Symmetry: C4
Amino acid sequence: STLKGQCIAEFLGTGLLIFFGVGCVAALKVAGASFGQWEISVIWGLGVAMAIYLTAGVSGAHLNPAVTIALWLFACFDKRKVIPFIVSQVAGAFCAAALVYGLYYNLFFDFEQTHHIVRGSVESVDLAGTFSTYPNPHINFVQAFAVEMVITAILMGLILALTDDGNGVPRGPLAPLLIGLLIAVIGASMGPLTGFAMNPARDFGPKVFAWLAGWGNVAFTGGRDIPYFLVPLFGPIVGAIVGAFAYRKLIGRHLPC
Amino acid sequence: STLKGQCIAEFLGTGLLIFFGVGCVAALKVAGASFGQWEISVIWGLGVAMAIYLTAGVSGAHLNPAVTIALWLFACFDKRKVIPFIVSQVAGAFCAAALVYGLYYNLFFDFEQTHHIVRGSVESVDLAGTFSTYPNPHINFVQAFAVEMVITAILMGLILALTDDGNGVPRGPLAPLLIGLLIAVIGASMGPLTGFAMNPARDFGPKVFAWLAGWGNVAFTGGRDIPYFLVPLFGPIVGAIVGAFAYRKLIGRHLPC
Amino acid sequence: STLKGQCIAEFLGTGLLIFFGVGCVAALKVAGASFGQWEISVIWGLGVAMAIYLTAGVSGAHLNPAVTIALWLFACFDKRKVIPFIVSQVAGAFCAAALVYGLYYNLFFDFEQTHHIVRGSVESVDLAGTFSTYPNPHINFVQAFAVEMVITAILMGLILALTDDGNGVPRGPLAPLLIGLLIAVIGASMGPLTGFAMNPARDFGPKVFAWLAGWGNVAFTGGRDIPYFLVPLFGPIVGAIVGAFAYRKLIGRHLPC
Amino acid sequence: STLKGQCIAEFLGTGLLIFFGVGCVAALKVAGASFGQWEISVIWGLGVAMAIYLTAGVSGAHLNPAVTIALWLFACFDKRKVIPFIVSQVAGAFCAAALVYGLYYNLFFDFEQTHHIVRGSVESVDLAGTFSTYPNPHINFVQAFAVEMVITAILMGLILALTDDGNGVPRGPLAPLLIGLLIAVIGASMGPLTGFAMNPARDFGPKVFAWLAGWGNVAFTGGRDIPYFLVPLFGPIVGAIVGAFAYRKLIGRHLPC
């Protein structure tokens, strides 16, 4: 497939997983749906598994800038398609957040009117957590960064263990379901800490939309002195690089390139 | 298989998925069972997956008028079997709703007696939601129509990605489980909005039964000025056509016909 | 395999599914565990799937007198092994109920002491529901019988659709998981009605143990004028025969014998 | 693979399953996450399934001293690699418990400050249950020992039924998912009794860490006159040996050695 077709798949695949994940969080927050921590995590995992299955044949189903960067550095992914893949992934997450917000538009404004929440204030960060992840109030910036690095390193280890070539997830039903199951257990055990972002596009995209939607600066900072948005922007990237290096050293599986 | 055998499978397959889905909603409403949003959605997805597996060999396991119409327009489905398939699907959903109502007959009347609900009134629409879907009170007709179009377009995209021929779901365990998993995540994220109908037969059939059972006109209108029953009647049909067109343009996979 | 080895597998397989199913109900009742209707049903389905996988190679993994009888009448199952299979299935369920009761012995007596429940009275039927199924208070004997016939007919239809020969469930992972998934959705939608017994051994076995354990006559009658134990004893048997006949007429798939 | 590579896989595989399992229990206890008994058990099962899949090719994916000992006695596992496997498994569980504690460090101390819990006292055993298992207050030492023996015998029976050689779990997706599903149903039905340890390393490792972390002697004794830590240390070992012997007698499947 050409670069244009590969970029469209990454745009659509990332948007698909954001549509399911953010939509279910919106249902729990403003629609009054009853969702447990395991239920929320299994929706994210199954949504990513479905997005991977529908895009693996075309673009390799990266849907993650951290995965794209690590595959370039520790596999056979071409460097010329790194930047277009990341922009497509970020744009897909931004567009899907707008779509979810449009469908839940009336329920969002009803929630603020009931609880007298003024959008853009510190108390509005809880409602801003529908689109992006925010840390537990008891953890700090360094603790939040460590969580993102660890969970993304585990995720990148499974991806490297599943790839046949060095380009991305192989075709078939086995690989997407394994990745989706890993995301579900990660979000159940480490989710209450940092929102198990594991994806720079999954967080930065919806964060930009929330800033445009009226939340303003608290969408990026999250109400903390140190802007929290750096944790999901670089934590997964460092974690994926660390996890990919560990796999290449403890196993060192051969690759075509 | 002949047309008569294919129509029987569509009648039975659609009835099977309504039996599981409506029965579980009845358990949550009048039987006091504890069910979450994810639990309700996963029951609908697994019920459809089982119905597809038991009917794929005979009739292709459409079980959806929107899927049948879209396959006729954008695949190799014959036009002569479009009308008999739709009537069989609608009749199967109507008959299964009567069966569920018969088994829960005593629990239904006990619920109305306890809460002094008069069947056929505006307050009885909540009990009428056991059989068919009704919108969130905060959303409007246009918003409800947009939800149905989006979710059915995603569902039709997966079906077109799984079909080997242009007639319906292929035989095997992989395709029904993928469709069932997609229905579960759709109902978890967009379910609290419009009941994730995605199926004109799943809604119109039980709606006709509820009108006969004593709910009257509120079974179709739902208590709104604009009759809500048009949203699940045509929303999925438009969504499936839109989703099928997008797949044929962004991918354009070859078909035997 | 010889008859002796086949009977041991049916004894162990039926005991395995009772151990998981009754144990989880005991956890919900006397151990204070939080379990939903979908959670209870999925435990029964997965337990049966595991029991089928461990016994399919030896005895065909019947684990159900209704399935054994229907396979004799509408498939190639030998009539000489019908009686020993049923006795092995009933004995396995009885022995597994005693094992679960032994492990939960202290928690059972603590529950009665706290709530002043005298074993053998009408109020003790709720605690007797740990081992066997009892009807919803609002349904009658005829309504309860109809529920058991319908759900067992659906279960027998899937089994006949999966068998390669006419002896039982084939080897492999596909068939047990399909049966387990069907049991889970059946118990979620029709479970709150009659306990989704679907198995004469699953009910009669533990019912005999509960009578020996001190519950007495209310273990069989359930507090009703008509003894409720006839519903799970013959309802599944009639339902399996009806469901097997429907499959042989609407499909008529060829069999070796 | 050499012994050094096999020991690294057992260290990492055991740490991976402890990271998911203990982390989710920490989320339920100190992070306020909503988790049911089935949800907790399915996280343990899926975490073990993922750990088995990532280590089966190298070391056979034992991740259990009871499984390692039983495979040595009733299969073709070499005796020279029994001790290094057990030490690697115990060290992996100890290290993973420290990692989970580090990530939840602030939430742990906040919980004690709110409830005035002094670490090392009898009331602190409830918080010490995050890392290791402790019995139900109504059961005794003998009852707790019987639970561990029974559940580990069932687990060892499935493992022996899945092994092609006599070294460990075979490669592929089927075997790890079957083991993970069995662990989930075991933890749902027998979990509220003894914490469904089934693994000497899963319990002893985190128990040693909890003693170092400040809980002291109550980490091992659990507040009982007879130290409870002997139940998960030897109960699974006896259960695995008993279960392996039963499989070799009731089936007697041939092995290469």
